[PDB]
Design a protein around this ligand. Sequence first.
Ligand SMILES: C[S@@+](CC[C@H](N)C(=O)[O-])C[C@H]1O[C@@H](n2cnc3c(N)ncnc32)[C@H](O)[C@@H]1O
Ligand code: NA
Length: 282
Amino acid sequence: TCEDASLCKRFAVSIGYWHDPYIQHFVRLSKERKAPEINRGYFARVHGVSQLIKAFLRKTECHCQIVNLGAGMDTTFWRLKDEDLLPSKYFEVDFPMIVTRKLHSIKCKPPLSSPILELHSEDTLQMDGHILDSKRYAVIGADLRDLSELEEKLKKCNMNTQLPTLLIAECVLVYMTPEQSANLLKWAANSFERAMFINYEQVNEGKSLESQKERLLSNGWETASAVDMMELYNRLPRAEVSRIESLEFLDEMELLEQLMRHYCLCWATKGGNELGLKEITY
Ligand SMILES: C[S@@+](CC[C@H](N)C(=O)[O-])C[C@H]1O[C@@H](n2cnc3c(N)ncnc32)[C@H](O)[C@@H]1O
Ligand code: NA
C-alpha cells in the first residue's frame, strides 16, 4: 500500500471524527468505504499531535514558533487561528511541487487566503516560486535532506532561533535514509537553545519505542518520550472516545489494536526547564 494522509484526514473529517472546515478546500473526498479502524487510527494520530502542540503553546504562552516539516496539506495553522492559539509564527516545509499545489489552493480559496492576510502586514501576498511568506504564516518549498538550504530559507522567512521552537515531523522521516533523518533531528536540536520535537511514525522492522527515544537523545535532544498508538488510544479522554466510537460500527475482531501497535508518537525537548518543557505529555 501507499496512502495520502491528507485524503484520509478529509475522509475521517467528513464522517465527524474531528472538526476541520479547511481540509475540504485542499483535497477531494473519496466515496469508497473504509475500514472504520483506519479512521480511528487517524483520529488518535491527529489528537495526539494536537495535544502535544497545545501543551507547548500553553507553556510558552504562544510566544514561540512551530515548524512543521513535511506538512503536506496540513490545516493546523487555520485550526489554531480559530482557537486563538497561534504561535508568534507558523512555518511549513515540504517539497517545492507539494508547496506549489498548496499555494494554488490558497490562491483559489478565500476561506484559506483571507485569514492569512488578516494577520499579515500588507493586503496582498507575493506567492513567487515555491514560497509563501507572511507575518504569521510561511510555507516553504525545500528538501529536508539539504539542511543548509532548509535553514537559509527558514531564516529568510524570519525564523528566529531565540524563540522556543516546536518542530514536527508527522510521517515524514520514513521518506529519508536513517542518516538523513538523524541529521535533520540533530540540526533541529543544534539550531535552538529551547525546543521541542514531535515525531509520529510507523514502527518498522527493527525499531522500537526505546530506539525511537534514543534516536532523539543521541541527536542532541535532552529529554524524550514515546508511546505506541494503542497506549495513546487507550488514554484518550472518555468524552472523545465516546464521541468518536459512536460515529461508526466496529466489528468484534479487535483489529484496531493490530493497526495501532505499529505506530508511535515520540516527542523530545531541549532547554526551557524554566518553561517546564520537559514536563509536556500527550
Ligand atoms: C506522509 S506525508 C505527511 C503529511 C503531513 N505531515 C500529515 O501528516 O498529514 C509526508 C510529507 O513529507 C514530505 N517530504 C518527504 N520527504 C521530504 C523531503 N526530503 N523534503 C521536503 N518534504 C518531504 C512529502 O512531500 C509529504 O508531503
Ligand atoms: Na518537488
